[PDB]
């Protein structure tokens, strides 16, 4: 089938990039950066968030494969020394595939609409001036959030920029998103939940600014100031990513080898 | 059909209890504390969860509800001014009905094994002295855990004990079960997770003692010493329980009111 | 004596500090802003922080007060209807002082040093990419610390933006700072304290780059990008804030009223 | 001088004592464990602590010295390979002191009072039921305390249980003492400060019941169960530890040691 493969264009992963396309080469595999269906990403998680933008507009007809030359990482999760036995079950075809749930961020402006999709996280702080927003759940009103921002995680973004926030770890296959504080304040004037929350498919979570209309967005990578912003739509994806399976790798053993010891 | 109903036993739940029976006498209703089909709670969730237990080994043929004369309950969500109006539309029936997710608790021993539901959570501390055990998930040691204590929280659960322990709250239509740590310690010899950890359906979270083989477990409101203990072992249960519907009240506004203000 | 007296700016405001001069007026006090002894704000503790940077380079010769035409403040600590009866004892003057520790902040750069006085509190955070500093506490590398940012908080600073990190609040009498991590990430490969530290005087933290040597830099309410900078350095100031007390307010007191209920 | 040395019964510690005292027979020194001047420990952190309350009621008249043979420790900060080195000097008199604060605890009832000194922290949790408290700074009430339990750390107990629960690291040469919240319940009805606070000496923070008059009070490692219990009283103590220095090992470089790497 069609395939490509991006690299971290370090030294290491450039070269361990050319030998999969060489050994590629000993088999029935056109190379096709259009309109591929294996997308090899050779680096580290960053690595493999790009690839997954650049590629985001054809999600259903591409499984991900992440190598890590570097640390072992939570999407490249496979060691350069299985690169070519990569290669031999990838191109005989007929491997598993796994999808993780994708988060929706919607913005509304006062021009139209902006919609983006986020493999880990989506964040939203303040443009210089205080973060205060109010915050809806299925159209109710639930707190008016003062402080530096909100960060709205994947189930396989919690072990990101969530767990930095104290949020949760959830197993990717809970199709759900997790919504964490970044230095609420908290007084007898002003309340806010604490806790982090998590919400099921078809929650939609709507922040609405108060006074300034001004706020910088992130959507993993990307970080823009959006202006004139009139509300920002969060919820549960449609869209799932797919995963090229070829063996056992839990991801709590995968949380375990980051985080207690590898 | 058949019903009942439990009190707090003060004098306020007494005569509101007398009230709906009264009222429930204007209809065809059998009042039968053995093999019930409705199950009403007047108090707060303590209450609530004491009915809970008192008949979870019917609890496919049970739809239970809360009223609160105290406070507003997470479970004893109807204020009293509701219960003429409850006892109408519970025995006219032909009412939705709604579930939760409950969690399943097995101890070994070195006798046999005892298992026990959980309608927030079940606990383990250890007996006196330090608290030490492996934390196996799925067959696979995760972390050695050294503190307090651990607690395995409900969706339902996680707004009570979990939330005093920074765990997420979580919309009970999810079929899941968080696990949080109770002060733990952590240093370069001892390393736990730190974060919450939330697990899907038919994930196996066991907990197998280092030196001392006693602890103290909880589930909801027991507590109970176990002697020469080999294993613990949570799991999100195949039972739900099942609540009568009767309004629209989102449990995340239930949140709201709860924790943010009435 | 000479005074002056700033205002939030409001209506509300401006109105008391026109009724406190004119009251002066039936006392020998000189209306000087440039020389004052008495320094009056009135406000919040926003206006008392400008009022205290206002003046920073004659802090000894200053006693400050604070006035919250809203909420309570823990610098605007007397409310409005408390003027005239400020207005006659400051005038009679023999009243008694109290003075609380501050903050230096030392920055140096490849040009010279900066230094600044902070009341409440100053934090470092990136120019945008990733914070990643080293820090050195008494000429010892103690971390690298990765993550949002930093914050070391005075005393009277730990009730703002100190608390909503996870810092301690301590009594304005203990001559110390406190510093905090701002969502620092930790796993194997990378390690912070978590915990938050505090300093006595003549300990010196120091902050130095690792990669990017850009970072915006915060002095209570001042936010500056500094560039090409070598280090930062924290440490208990030399000089002290003085306040002019005319009433037991205690500390414990503020804080009771300012988070649990007035 | 007289001296005397605890071992932590294990073979590794038991024989260096005897090797150190075989040193000491070398030189002018009695071994009295009655009025010892010298006392050292050989084992971890808790063989202090026992060496510390084994003999609390000298304390002015004792210089402390740690050796760990396991793991470095906070108290047992020497390596067994400098026991013959430290043998030499502290024979050799003339050595300089350090003196660490200490938390006095009292306990009255409805018979008579009971004090307590502590190295670490005190703890207070119920008796089974539920632990509720109101909680009194300098005869002003605070908080009702709804929850787990209270800790009150010395500034060196900071890096044990008080680090567990969020609390704060702070010189031992700073004299306070520090209060942290375990598992506290916070709602619209029931409100913590949730902040640890940090006291200088001569503050007066009082534990007083509400309901339950029986609570497990621990004091560094005993635990016993207090009943009838009227007031739990906390303040900085006016005795203090006198440790023997022989070497620079900075504490903040023992917290380094012990929690980022050694
Ligand atoms: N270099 C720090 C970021 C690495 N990283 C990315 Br990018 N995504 C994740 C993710 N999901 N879990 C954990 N770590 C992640
Ligand atoms: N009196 C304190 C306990 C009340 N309580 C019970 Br009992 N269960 C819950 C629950 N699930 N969420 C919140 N609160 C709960
Ligand atoms: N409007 C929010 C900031 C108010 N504020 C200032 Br400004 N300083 C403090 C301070 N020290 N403690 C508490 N609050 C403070
Ligand atoms: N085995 C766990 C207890 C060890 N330990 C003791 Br005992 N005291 C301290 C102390 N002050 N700081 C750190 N650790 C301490």
Redesign the interface.
Request: charged share 15%; glycine share 10%; no cysteine.
């Given at each position: 089938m069609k395939y490509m493969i991006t690299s971290k264009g370090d030294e290491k992963s450039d070269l361990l990039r050319l030998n999969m396309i060489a050994g590629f080469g000993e088999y029935d595999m056109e190379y096709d950066d259009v309109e591929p269906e294996i997308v090899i990403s050779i680096g580290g998680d960053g690595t493999f968030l790009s690839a997954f933008h650049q590629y985001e507009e054809r999600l259903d007809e591409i499984a991900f494969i992440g190598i890590h030359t570097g640390?072992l990482g939570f999407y490249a999760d496979w060691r350069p020394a299985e690169a070519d036995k990569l290669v031999k079950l990838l191109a005989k075809g007929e491997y598993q595939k796994v999808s993780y749930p994708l988060l929706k961020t919607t913005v509304k402006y006062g021009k139209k609409e902006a919609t983006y999709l986020a493999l880990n996280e989506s964040t939203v702080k303040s443009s210089?001036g205080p973060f205060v927003v109010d915050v809806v759940?299925?159209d109710?009103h639930?707190?008016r959030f003062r402080?530096?921002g909100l960060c709205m995680s994947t189930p396989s973004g919690t072990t990101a920029?969530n767990?930095?926030?104290?949020?949760?770890?959830?197993?990717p296959?809970?199709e759900?998103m997790?919504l964490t504080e970044?230095?609420?304040?908290?007084?007898?004037?002003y309340?806010?939940?604490?806790?982090?929350?998590?919400?099921?498919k078809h929650?939609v979570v709507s922040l609405q600014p108060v006074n300034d209309k001004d706020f910088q967005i992130s959507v993993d990578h990307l970080?823009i100031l959006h202006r004139d912003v009139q509300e920002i739509r969060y919820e549960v994806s449609a869209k799932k990513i797919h995963f090229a399976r070829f063996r056992s790798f839990?991801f709590?053993?995968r949380?375990?080898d980051?985080?207690?010891?590898?």
């Open positions: 640390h210089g759940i299925n109710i639930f707190e402080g530096d920029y767990k930095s926030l104290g949020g949760a770890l959830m197993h296959s809970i759900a997790q970044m230095a609420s304040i908290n007084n007898r004037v309340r806010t939940i604490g806790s982090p929350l998590v919400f099921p929650h970080s839990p709590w053993r949380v375990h980051s985080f207690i010891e590898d």
